């Protein structure tokens, strides 16, 4: 069927069809364009007119321009030939290395796995990051979310995870850049060529890259997370495989939806969001999952507008996750990096029957001493340190050491810290904090605990400080 | 003579700090509710303006 | 025939506008050409606004829509027990069809004022903080409320697990059938949940109704009504059910999606003016029936998620005023070690004592007072050197009682176990035990009495209360054990 | 005349009429239904269509379904037969005791009494409860804000007021439950039967009950306070009585109104409340007053959203209040019934120009001593109750006797307690307190003044302790 | 034009707060329904497509660059607001200036803990890296400890030293 | 009338807060855009045009006057609010 | 508010008046820390004027940051150095008040006009500690520094 453009307002194009109407979610191709312009059908308006969202810029479009119905939703290349390659939203190569010659294509829209396909298996995925491993550890095949306001550390954290866990992972990885910086996509691509995770010469590439960044119009940003997830679904299902899925940043799928909502004729919900925020998120997130067919460890950076965790977007994301890392600007401001809130990060596997009573009892003890300090802070900030008993001020000194021992220089953050990166084993993390909790280092100064790996580095540092 | 003067003074100073904290509590509660009401109203006016503009 | 059928004018975002269907009733389930169902929420002069139960890629402009004689109803009865079903009662656990003989409409009026009697029978959760300080009765609506990850679902699951001790017994009166309604949750979360209920052998007397995050808005809206109807099978046949709505926050969001897209007028937080009505009509359906009506009950435990502690937000406000009481959870209590994280100063049950056994009532009354008097003073704790001995006593009794309310997850206690534990603290036996040793003490003390004193426990239960004889027996168990503990 | 439904959108129904239109506020009767579905006209949209709010679920309604203009607003049974009965918002009985047999019906919407019909005089309404009458006296035809809430004896106090008003004034009562929790409405019914104020046996009931339960649409909960009010109007206008109207609770009246306003597509005002917030409240409240024929006096339970007294809902309510009765948990735990806070409760008519110059100075004197007792309470848990001067020891001894003298055994709680009920005359209340202040009872023990009626029982109880 | 011809350009947008207000006017007059704070739904995208064009080109594309310093005006020091965080979420760092710092005599009035560079030492000469490499984190810890120390009560040599170093670097 | 005929009147508006609430009711029912506290943009003009009419006339126009004592109710002493200011 | 916020960019000098300051009886009620001028540049006003202006603003900002502690605990808990900036700051605040000819009915003082040089000198002297002995109230509602000194002597 051939249609004609009747209205263009930004990213939203109305198209009239004389004959058969393309169903909702169909990809339309605009004729008379220099590069492929796909319109995705969003609504049937009536009077043989569909409302669509464009996947690229609508500049140059003319009323009356011809549009062809492709017969199906956006279909993208999947399979091993995506490895080492970069795709955009509609599956075109953007790495300048020619065609992606796969046998199969897959629609980017699909049903979420059924309830009977669910797995309940959960075992710890050690990262080497002290605060995460200790207080809110990730699970293999689990859903991990990294929450934070702008510039507080989501991407640095996700690069450290990629460094610590993906660089020597057995199976495949997918990285989806969604509404983030193009500069970052270039940094990452060359870092992975340099590390051999991507190989431009042979066929041992272990990562597939999908990009639709903040220079892209909202239709592209609203669909590109589906493109990446589709690549990962194939690996999970059609190779029964162990997959790592990284998304930075999943908020940008929701934000892009909100950009076009008014033009789609919706009354706004609270805080300016599309009324379908939660169902839109549901039908996307519920595909990002382990099944009985295969495992996906997903790590999603989640932007928090105006630093408000109650913002509808982040607030609705929490329930889709098995583990959460919450970053805080108040903490970053202090030089504590990674800027994780020890009292707002949680994990489904933080249970004594899963991580053992020793990991658990230490984790809970660390959080207790930080909550107690948090509840003292403002009082002693006025009545003075002297009014405290010799045990109230013991937990003050200890809590401040523990706050510092949760910091850690990242390999990937050397350009910012001026410190060499550290990876810390679980046992050492546990022991380190066990020891400070038990009083073993009441004689060392606070600063000795700032920005080191294992607990021995803090004893080392204390001697170095002595003069 | 000294502790009589110290414990009198501390009693007095702690009386004053308690009363000062109490007044600040009153004033911050008022500010709280003014902000509380305005957030509701502002959030609603946004929803209305959007609905109306369609 | 544009009276029994219609045609689609426009379709998008789960809302179909349909020319015709001149004879559809308000809220009737219709059917699209593709097989999808839809519900007629807006009857307008020139169109029906139909809410779509599925993905609308299957519906185009021009599509034929039919009235079918359909009724929005669910399977009902004991064949649902141990089953996991969607919002319309279809099995989703893969274990074949539901062997259901009866059905029931999801939209029905609550029993009126007359067919009910006062709430008097305990609904035991097994959680010390709740069973003693926020007691729930059969036919009560008690809200579990708090921010994300404060332990709301855990209260509910522990509650469900606890019922095994009654459902395995012989006394039919004390039995309680459980309904867990999962709304807007992720599937794997619901899987973990039924896994937990299975390993605890609680699934056999539990229905799980699940309208998850990728189910259409209309399904999430319905799910709590469906589950309520299942519970009413029990309420109306001399039996007792417990329903958990986890959570009503997400149900309201799904309703708002529909309202806004049917272009009904937005109010506070963009909610429609009938959202109060949505929940009040749900929660009045929970009741205690009188003997003439069968003596049965439906207890409700709705769950609301707050955002940064704001209990004065719109939907929390609504559900708070509708219910008979609230269990308030707090993040700060949680990390201080108060788990379960119940704010015992704020939490309330309007049924109260009427829903407590005599033995609990006794010790809980003392605990309440001693904790209230503690709260008055709790800030002189780390700033108290020269307090009078009377208030060092309040502080000490207080921190100790507080430790007794701490409770591990997945281990609900029998009532007489709870009173034995509380007795130990309210009688002063733990006043010289360092506060950090208390939970070690309790775990050990309770194993002991459960081991060697099944008869003392059998009797604390039987006598309704604590006799003079039980008092003497407890005194010697406790003194001697304590002496042994601190050796 | 007969209209056809042309639109159903939730609790909002549009009805088209071929001839003459039902004016705004008319009750419409929907045809072809199991139970009675009433629609209240809200607007004329033009083109012979009206927009209506539903008093019950609209599920099942069909476009074209027939609707009957009843020719008037909602009309309900009024008169002595409403007593001890429970009706809903459209006047139907819901206690299951058959029909309500009255000669008269009344429309629930009615304008307030005109300016010329206004009493210019402000009379006390003697309750016979010492705390109230002495310190925060109810004003005849005034509104009283009842604070505290659930737990502190609101229900006992309510029932006692019904009792003491039907007793010492020959006035009846109405109880309007706006958003009544079904469980609590049942509970209330049975408490009232058990205390006597309702009687299923004879015709000596003292209260009519009107319930608009939480599970009903907003139109219904918005109108019930008016239904309740109509009932009350009968006893003031037709029977000349000083009536008592209970509204539990007024916030839920505002809320339902805000809901109806939202559903009608009106733009919300500050904090989400209806634009008509002040007039919604005004056109209801103004009906409660003293006319030449009689008076309605209203006790209204207030919920303060966010404990914020500047919130539009409480702030709009307070403009209409002549007194507050503050029930307090602190007082209850000290065993003083009723648990009225004697310093927190206030009266607008507590004025020498309105009540006695003697009534005023006794109440002011009681206040000052109770306020002065509070100052000395820091100097007690420090220096002990002996380091005080003879002036300061005297006010402690008198204040504590006053606190206890403010307690009262209620008739309505004879079953649960065992003590016999007391209804203290206003002149005796004034006298009692005047004399404890004077020192005419300093020789008597402190617990002689607790749970007694008039000061004459303080003498009788102090002798029986010897 | 400089960027794509092997040359280097610097652009200052002074300021993008006033641009957004102009965009808002135009958008509302076009009758596009307003979003959050009355701005259009796509106010992030207004600035994101603008600032993405500041870029460093590889040698095959001529080695040129466009560097951007957009300016945003806050109200009452609130960097955490919607439009401010929108822009912070676009750029490779921000320099946050505060009046309190300014009046105290810290000029330029840069808040250290709240400012960041997302390129870090990679945009410094080695000489500047050798002296400045750990200073930013150091100065963040200095300000925290200065506050905790506020009341001069028995402090160890280590914190005393950090304090001495901090005040002098300032 | 008095002001304009060499006489002196005094007017009390008790109260102008309640009048403003009346006007906001009317303005919102007219779907006029709500501003601060949901008040219409012309709530200031409502009171300004009214209170300007209280004047002292010179001898050439009779020497009469209208004196106005408008009443405003604050919420909890807040004199900085929109209508008070 | 959009109206005033948008106006700021149109001005070369802004005088921001504060109700808080008015209610303390400081007139004119100018916020010393919120009022700015495009010509407050040492190359335009000269370095002495510039330096004294910046010194005043520093002491006032310093005082403002100590005011949280003052409100709860009071003056007594301050160090001796902080008590000094407080007492100099409070003197500066009052020295910035001034009787206006136009406001004589409200102040009960005759109006004053102060030459710029006498303005610089006055504040320069207060900052330098030359008047730590004089009481606060002597700097209130005067013209040149000489009047506050005469006022000081009169207060006996
Ligand atoms: N782990 C860390 N160590 C040191 N500095 C960090 C760390 N994380 C973030 N930062 C600082 O914050 C800047 C922004 O962090 P980034 O991860 O890009 O923020 P976002 O959370 O917006 O993705 C970084 O470029 C760096 O300067
Ligand atoms: N009594 C308890 N003791 C220890 N941990 C608990 C307890 N109750 C809940 N938790 C833990 O707290 C976390 C949050 O509990 P959950 O019931 O999921 O809260 P919510 O439903 O409010 O999000 C979970 O990891 C859970 O295992
Ligand atoms: F600015 Be960050 F990438 F959210
Ligand atoms: Mg990032
Ligand atoms: Mg939960």
């Amino acid at each position: 069927t051939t249609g004609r453009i009747v209205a263009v307002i930004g990213a939203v194009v109305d198209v009239q069809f004389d004959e058969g109407l393309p169903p909702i979610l169909n990809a339309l191709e605009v004729q008379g364009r220099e590069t492929r312009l796909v319109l995705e059908v969003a609504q049937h308006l009536g009077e043989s007119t569909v409302r669509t969202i464009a996947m690229d810029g609508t500049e140059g479009l003319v009323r009356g321009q011809k549009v062809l119905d492709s017969g199906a939703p956006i279909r993208i290349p999947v399979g091993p030939e995506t490895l080492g390659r970069i795709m955009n939203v509609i599956g075109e190569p953007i790495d300048e290395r020619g065609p992606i010659k796969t046998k199969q294509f897959a629609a980017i829209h699909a049903e979420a796995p059924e309830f009977v396909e669910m797995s309940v298996e959960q075992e710890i995925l050690v990262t080497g990051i002290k605060v995460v491993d200790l207080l809110a550890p990730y699970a293999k095949g689990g859903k991990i979310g990294l929450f934070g306001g702008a510039g507080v550390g989501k991407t640095v954290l996700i690069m450290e995870l990629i460094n610590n866990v993906a660089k020597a992972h057995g199976g495949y990885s997918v990285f989806a850049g969604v509404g983030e910086r193009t500069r970052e996509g270039n940094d990452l691509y060359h870092e992975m060529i340099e590390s051999g995770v991507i190989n431009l010469k042979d066929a041992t590439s272990k990562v597939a890259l999908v990009y639709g960044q903040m220079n892209e119009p909202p239709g592209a940003r609203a669909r590109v997370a589906l493109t990446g997830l589709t690549v990962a679904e194939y690996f999970r299902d059609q190779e029964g495989q162990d997959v790592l899925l990284f998304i930075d940043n999943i908020f940008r799928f929701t934000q892009a939806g909100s950009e076009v909502s008014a033009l789609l004729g919706r009354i706004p919900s609270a805080v300016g969001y599309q009324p379908t925020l939660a169902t839109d998120m549901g039908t996307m997130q519920e595909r990002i999952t382990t099944t009985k067919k295969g495992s996906i460890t997903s790590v999603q950076a989640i932007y928090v507008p105006a630093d408000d965790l109650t913002d509808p977007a982040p607030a609705t994301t929490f329930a889709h996750l098995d583990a959460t890392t919450v970053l805080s600007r108040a903490i970053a401001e202090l030089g504590i990096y990674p800027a994780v809130d020890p009292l707002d990060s949680t994990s489904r596997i933080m249970d004594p029957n899963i991580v053992g009573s020793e990991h658990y009892d230490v984790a809970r003890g660390v959080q207790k001493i930080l909550q107690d300090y948090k509840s003292l802070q403002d009082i002693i900030a006025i009545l003075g340190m002297d009014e405290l008993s010799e045990e109230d001020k013991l937990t003050v000194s200890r809590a401040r050491k523990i706050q510092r021992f949760l910091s850690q220089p990242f390999q990937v953050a050397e350009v910012f810290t001026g410190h060499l990166g550290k990876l810390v084993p679980l046992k050492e993390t546990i022991k380190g904090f066990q020891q400070i909790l038990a009083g073993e280092y009441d004689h060392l100064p606070e600063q000795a605990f700032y920005m080191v790996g294992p607990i021995e580095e803090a004893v080392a540092k204390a001697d170095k400080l002595a003069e | 003579e000294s502790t009589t003067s110290e414990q009198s003074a501390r009693m007095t100073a702690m009386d004053n700090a308690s009363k000062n904290a109490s007044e600040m509590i009153d004033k911050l509660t008022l500010t709280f509710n003014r902000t509380r009401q305005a957030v509701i109203t502002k959030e609603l006016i946004e929803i209305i303006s959007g609905a109306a503009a369609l | 025939d544009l009276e029994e059928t219609g045609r689609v004018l426009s379709i998008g975002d789960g809302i179909a506008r349909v020319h015709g269907l001149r004879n559809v009733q308000a809220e009737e389930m219709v059917e699209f050409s593709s097989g999808l169902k839809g519900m007629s929420l807006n009857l307008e002069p020139d169109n029906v606004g139909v809410v779509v139960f599925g993905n609308d890629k299957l519906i185009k402009e021009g599509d034929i829509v039919k009235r079918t004689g359909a009724i929005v109803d669910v399977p009902v009865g004991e064949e649902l027990l141990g089953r996991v079903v969607d919002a319309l009662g279809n099995a989703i656990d893969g274990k074949g069809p539901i062997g259901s003989k009866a059905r029931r409409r999801v939209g029905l009026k609550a029993p009126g004022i007359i067919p009910r009697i006062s709430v008097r029978e305990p609904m035991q959760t097994g959680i010390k903080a709740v069973d003693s300080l926020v007691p729930i009765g059969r036919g009560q609506r008690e809200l579990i409320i708090g921010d994300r990850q404060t332990g709301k679902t855990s209260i509910a699951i522990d509650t469900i697990i606890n019922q095994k001790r009654f459902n395995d017994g012989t006394d039919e009166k004390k039995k309680l059938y459980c309904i867990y309604v999962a709304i807007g949750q992720k599937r794997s979360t619901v899987a973990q949940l039924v896994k937990r209920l299975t390993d605890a052998d609680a699934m056999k007397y539990t229905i799980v109704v699940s309208a998850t995050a990728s189910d259409a808005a209309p399904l999430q809206y319905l799910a709590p009504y469906s589950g309520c109807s299942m519970g009413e099978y029990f309420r109306d046949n001399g039996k007792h059910a417990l329903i958990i709505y986890d959570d009503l926050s997400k149900q309201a969001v799904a309703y708002r999606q529909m309202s806004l897209l049917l272009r009904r007028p937005p109010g506070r937080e963009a909610y429609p003016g009938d959202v109060f009505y949505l929940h009040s009509r749900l929660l009045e359906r929970a009741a205690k029936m009188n003997d003439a009506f069968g003596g049965g009950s439906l207890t409700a435990l709705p769950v609301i998620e707050t955002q940064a502690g704001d209990v004065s937000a719109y939907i929390p406000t609504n559900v708070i005023s509708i219910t008979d009481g609230q269990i308030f959870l707090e993040t700060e209590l949680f990390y201080k070690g108060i788990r379960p994280a119940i704010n015992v100063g704020l939490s309330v049950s309007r049924v109260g004592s009427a829903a407590q056994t005599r033995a609990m009532k006794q010790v809980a009354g003392t605990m309440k007072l001693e904790l209230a008097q503690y709260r008055e003073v709790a800030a002189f704790a780390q700033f108290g050197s020269d307090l009078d001995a009377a208030t060092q006593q309040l502080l000490s009794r207080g921190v100790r009682l507080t430790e007794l309310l701490k409770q591990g997850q997945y281990s609900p206690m029998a009532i007489e176990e709870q009173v034995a534990v509380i007795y130990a603290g309210v009688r002063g036996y733990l006043d010289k035990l360092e506060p950090s040793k208390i939970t070690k003490f309790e775990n050990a003390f309770l194993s002991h009495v459960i081991s060697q004193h099944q008869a003392l426990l059998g009797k604390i239960r039987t006598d309704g209360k604590i006799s003079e004889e039980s008092d003497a027996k407890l005194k010697e168990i406790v003194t001697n054990f304590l002496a042994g503990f601190e050796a």
Side-chain angles (χ1 to χ4, degrees), chain A residues 148-151 154-155 180-181 184 249 252 303:
Chain A
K154 300 172 292 297
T155 299
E180 283 312 316
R181 306 177 177 76
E184 287 171 355
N249 185 300
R252 306 282 183 206
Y303 182 74

Side-chain angles (χ1 to χ4, degrees), chain A residues 151 181-183 214 252 306-307 311 334 400 404 415 447:
Chain A
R181 306 177 177 76
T182 297
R183 172 182 72 74
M214 64 173 79
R252 306 282 183 206
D307 287 2
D311 191 278
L334 305 186
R400 291 180 58 85
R404 272 144 189 86
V415 290
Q447 271 308 282

Side-chain angles (χ1 to χ4, degrees), chain A residues 21 24 43-44 46-48 113 115-116 120 265-266 269 275 279 282 286 320 322 344 348 368 371 392, chain C residues 9-11 13 57 60-61 92-93 148-149 186-187 189 191-192 213 256-257 263 332 335 382-383:
Chain A
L21 227 60
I24 293 171
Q43 280 161 353
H44 290 184
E47 292 161 3
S48 306
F115 185 67
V116 284
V120 295
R266 284 89 157 274
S269 183
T279 49
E286 283 288 84
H320 291 281
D322 301 313
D344 201 9
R348 187 170 318 280
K368 184 180 187 298
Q371 186 61 75
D392 325 337
Chain C
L9 293 161
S10 65
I11 172 67
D13 310 313
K57 93 200 153 158
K60 315 211 281 198
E61 186 203 343
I92 58 164
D93 57 13
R148 48 183 166 81
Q149 303 143 186
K186 68 167 170 48
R187 269 159 189 163
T189 287
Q192 291 287 351
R256 174 180 71 188
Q257 184 189 304
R263 288 166 169 254
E332 254 156 282
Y335 290 111
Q382 283 177 292
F383 290 89

Side-chain angles (χ1 to χ4, degrees), chain C residues 152-153 180 185 246:
Chain C
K152 301 180 296 297
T153 296
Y180 183 85
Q185 290 185 27
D246 204 351

